[PDB]
Structure 1
Amino acid sequence: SSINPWILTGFADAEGSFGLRIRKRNKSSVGYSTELGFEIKLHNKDKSILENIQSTWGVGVIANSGSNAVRLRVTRFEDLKVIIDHFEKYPLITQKYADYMLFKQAFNVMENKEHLTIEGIKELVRIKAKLNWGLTDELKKAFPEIISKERSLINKNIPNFKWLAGFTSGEGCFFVNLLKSKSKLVQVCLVFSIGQHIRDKNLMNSLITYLGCGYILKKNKSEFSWLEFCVTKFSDIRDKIIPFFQEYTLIGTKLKDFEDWCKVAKLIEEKKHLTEEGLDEIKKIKLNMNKGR
C-alpha cells in the first residue's frame, strides 16, 4: 500500500537513521571505501510498515536484524537519490535533520566523485565527525587533526498534521494506568506519553502549544536522561488527543493500541469506570494492550 509522505517523514524522524562508513581498505586508491545508508529497524510485528515505505519509495531492501527485529535499509547510491528528493520535499524537524543534511553533503561529495581523492576522504571524515556518534577510534588516529565534532541546533515548527501522526506512531504510547485508590473498587487513568532525548527539548514543548494540553516530565537513568510529554487530564484526552489521532490515522501496531485506548476512553466518558463490570471491561482491555494483545 502507499504511505502518506508527511506520515513517512514523521515516522522517519522517530525511527530512521542515516549512516556514513569510512572503512580502511588496502586495495583502495584512496585507502578507504565509503558507504551511505538510511535504515528503519522495528520489531517484526510492524514489518508491514516497512513494506509500505518500500512500496512507496520503490527502493530499499527489507531484511531480518536478528530473531525479533527487521530493517529496511537503503545503501545503493542511485537509490539514495530517491531518499534525498523525498526529504527535500518533506524535511524532518528533529535534531536528526542535522544528520540527514550531513548525510546529503556526503552524497554530494560522492556525486562529484571527490571521494576518490585524498581531500575528498578528508572532507567526508569531517562530515562524519558531526554525524550521529562521530568518528571512530581508528579514524581519529588516522586523522588526528579533524577534531571539530560540534553541531548546529535544529528548530522547525511541526510542518504538517500528518507529520505528528507518523512521529507519534514512532515514539508514542497510549497507556491505561490502574492505580490503587481508597474506595470500594482502583483509579483508572488514561495517560498519553511521548519521550525524546533532550536535544529536542524545544520540539517537546512545541507539542503543548500544538496540541493544546499536556506537560513535560524530565526523567533520568544514571548518565542518560530523556524528556516525556504527557497528557493525563481526561478533558484534553477526550477532546484533543483522541480526536486528533482519529482525524490523522496512525499506522502499524500502535494503531490497535490506540483503538483499544479509545475503547477505555468511551467507558470513562460513560462513568462506567467506577462500576464493577466497568473496571472489569477496561481491565481486560489493558490486559490485551501493549505488551500482550
Structure 2
Amino acid sequence: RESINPWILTGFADAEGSFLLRIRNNNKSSVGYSTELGFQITLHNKDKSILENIQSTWKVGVIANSGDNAVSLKVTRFEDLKVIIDHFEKYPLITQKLGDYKLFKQAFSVMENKEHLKENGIKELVRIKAKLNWGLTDELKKAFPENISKERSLINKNIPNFKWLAGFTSGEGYFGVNLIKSKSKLGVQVQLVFKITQHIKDKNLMNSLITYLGCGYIRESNKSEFSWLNFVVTKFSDINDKIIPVFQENTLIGVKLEDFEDWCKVAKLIEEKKHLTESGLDEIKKIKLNMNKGR
C-alpha cells in the first residue's frame, strides 16, 4: 500500500528495529564460518501492514511468520543492504541503536571486499560482533582467543524533528484512558495518560522529551532485577494542547493510530466537560473497552 515518510520510518526503527550479524559454524566454509548480515523488524501480526509498507518503501526485505502471533521483515540480501545504509545515512538513528548501525556498516564493508571468506575478514567480523547487541557467545569468543573489546561509544543525539518522534512513538508510545475508581457520586474520574517507555541506556534522550514537548515527567519503574523509564504526561491541558496536536500533524502508523484517534475522541469529550456526565462517562467507558487491549 502506501509508503512511509522516511523520518517516521527511522523513528520506528529506533523503536523496533535491530541489526543482525550471524557468524555461524560451517563445515563447508573455507574459513569454517559463514556469515549473514542485515536489519529486521518483528511485530505482532496485527501490524503486518506496517512491515508491508516498509517493504514497499524500501523495495527490499522478506516478510515471514515468526511464531503464532508475530511477523517479521528481514533484510539480509547483501546488495539490498545498500538501501538500508543509504536510508540511515540520510535519515540517521538517534538511540543507542545507532551504535549498532555503525557496526552493521562496518561489517558491510568487510563483506563487500569479500574479506569475510578469509581468516582476516572473519576475525574482523568477530571483533565487530563483540560490540553488537548481545555480543559473542561463549563458544564463539573461545574460538577467536584474542582480547576483544566489548565496549563502544555511547550515542548522545537530539530528537531531529517531529516525524522521528511520530515513528518512535508509534513504536513505544502509550495512549491510555485511566478510569480512576472513586467511591464518589459519578464515581470514575477519567484521566488521559501519555507514556513513552524506554530503557535507561537512553536517559538523556528521554530527558530531552520534557523540553522537546514542553511537558511531562520522567519516572523509573522496575521488575525485580530490571529497570526502565517512562516519559509521562497526565495534566490534561498538556495533552489536549501539546501532545495531541503533535500527532495530528505527524501522523502515527500501525493499529496504534486507531488508539490515538480514539484517545482523541475521549479527549474532546473531556474538553466539553462531558466526562462529568453519566452520558459522557458511559461513552468513554465504551471507547476504552474497544481500544488498546480491548481492540
TM bracket (short chain): over 0.9
Q: Deviations over 1:213-265 (max 9, x none)?
A: 00001011111111000000101001000011001111110000000001110
Tell me, yes or no, if structure 1 residue 287 matches structure 2 residue 289: yes
Partner AA of 1:217 in structure 2: R
Query: 1:109 is paired with a residue of what secondary structure?
Result: helix
Aligned equivalent of 1:269: 271
- Equivalenced residue count is 293
Helix, strand or coil at the partner of 1:291 = helix
Aligned residue for 2:96? 95
Contact 1:126 1:146 in 2 (8 A): no
Distance in structure 1 (CA, Å) of the matches to 2:28 and 2:293: 49
- Contact preservation (8 Å) 2:288, 2:294: no
- Per the alignment, residue 121 of structure 2 pairs with 120
Q: Distance in 2 between matches of 1:71 and 1:254?
A: 18
**8 Å CA contact retained: 1:109, 1:115:** yes
TM-score (norm 1): 0.98
Aligned residue type for 2:84: I
CA distance in 2, matches of 1:25, 1:70: 28
Alignment pair present for 1:135 and 2:136: yes
The answer for the alignment partner of 1:66 in structure 2 is 67
Q: How does 1:72-83 map to 2 (within 5 A)?
A: 72-83=73-84
C-alpha distance in 2 between matches for 1:59 and 1:181: 53
**Structure 2: which amino acid aligns with 1:292?**
G
Structure 1 counterpart of 2:231: 229
The residue identity in structure 1 corresponding to 2:125 is L
Task: For 2:265, give the aligned amino acid.
Answer: K
- 1:160 has 2:161 as partner: yes
More moved, 55-64 vs 182-191 = 182-191
2:255 corresponds in structure 1 to 253
Q: CA deviation at 1:144?
A: 2.8
SS of the counterpart of 1:278? helix
Matching residue of 2:195: 193
Contact between 1:46 and 1:253, CA under 8 Å: does it hold in 2? yes
Contact 1:196/1:228 (8 A) holds in 2? yes
**Is the 2:47–2:255 Cα contact (8 Å) retained in structure 1?**
yes
Q: TM-score, normalised by structure 2?
A: 0.98
SS of structure 1 residue aligned to 2:247: helix
CA distance in 2, matches of 1:111, 1:91: 22
On the 8 A contact 1:125/1:146 being kept in 2, the answer is no
Contiguous gaps of at least 5 residues in structure 1? none
Q: Is the partner of 1:37 in helix, strand or coil?
A: strand
Contact 2:220 2:229 in 1 (8 A): yes
CA–CA separation in structure 1 for the residues paired with 2:218 and 2:183: 28
**Distance between the aligned counterparts of 2:92 and 2:34, measured in 1?**
28
Give the distance between the partners of 2:170 and 2:265, measured in 1 at CA.
Answer: 18
Quote the residue 2:52 is aligned against: 51
Contact 1:140/1:146 (8 A) holds in 2: no
Distance 2:39 2:147 in 1: 24
Q: By how many angstroms is 1:123 displaced? A: 1.0
SS at match of 1:86: helix
Instruction: Quote the Cα distance in structure 2 between the aligned partners of 1:40 and 1:97.
Output: 15
Residue 239 (structure 2) pairs with residue 218 (structure 1): no
Alpha-carbon deviations, 1:106-151, whole Å to 9, x = none? 0011111111221211111110000000001110111232431112
Query: What CA RMSD, in Å, does the superposition of the two structures yield over aligned residues?
Result: 0.9
C-alpha distance in 2 between matches for 1:160 and 1:240? 15
Counterpart Cα distance in 2 of 1:292 and 1:258: 14
Moved over 2 A (4+): 144-147
